Amino acid sequence: SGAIYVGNYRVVNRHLATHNDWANLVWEDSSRDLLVSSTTAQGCDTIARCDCQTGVYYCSSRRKHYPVSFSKPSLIFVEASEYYPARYQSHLMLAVGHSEPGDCGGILRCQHGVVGIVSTGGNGLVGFADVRDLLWLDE
Numbered sequence: 594s595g596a597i598y599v600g601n602y603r604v605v606n607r608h609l610a611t612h613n614d615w616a617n618l619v620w621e622d623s624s625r626d627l628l629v630s631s632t633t634a635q636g637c638d639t640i641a642r643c644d645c646q647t648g649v650y651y652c653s654s655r656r657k658h659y660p661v662s663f664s665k666p667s668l669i670f671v672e673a674s675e676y677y678p679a680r681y682q683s684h685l686m687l688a689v690g691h692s693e694p695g696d697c698g699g700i701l702r703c704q705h706g707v708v709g710i711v712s713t714g715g716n717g718l719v720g721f722a723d724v725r726d727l728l729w730l731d732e
């Protein structure tokens with residue numbers, strides 16, 4: 594589990610979004626596993642606007658933060674699941690690191706702020722849904 598609170602928005606994994614998220618929907622994209630809903634309070638997370646390929650992520654299955662090198666946002670094949678058929682997920686960045694399904698929502702951050710959230714994993718690899726291109730989260 595896990596979300597990004599910036600301004601009047603809440604950013605979560607689309608496959609984990611609540612009824613409240615869908616009732617206050619701003620934008621969703623199944624191909625990125627992202628959903629953004631509106632909030633009544635002011636979130637204080639800062640979004641990074643950079644091309645960093647190093648950062649730190651929170652791994653709930655280990656109650657620990659891990660430093661990682663990660664790839665640039667790209668289209669990557671993601672095996673079928675209870676939430677989606679087999680498909681290419683866009684804007685995904687991979688890193689060598691531990692992850693388990695309940696780890697989705699863990700934040701990835703660089704020295705410039707929030708980079709994205711855990712969205713995929715499998716065989717000593719963790720995938721992150723990038724959020725740095727969503728310039729409207731700030732405005």
Ligand SMILES: CSc1cc2c(cc1NC(=O)N1CCC[C@H](C(N)=O)C1)CCC(=O)N2
Pocket residue numbers: 608626671674676677682692693694695696697711712713714715716717720
């Ligand atoms: C960190 S998630 C994860 C971690 C692990 C495993 C599976 C997942 N599940 C995943 O990749 N999903 C399902 C949930 C929607 C995901 C999606 N974006 O379509 C795709 C298998 C065991 C393991 O070592 N790590």
Ligand SMILES: [Zn+2]
Pocket residue numbers: 641642643644645703704705706
């Ligand atoms: Zn950065």
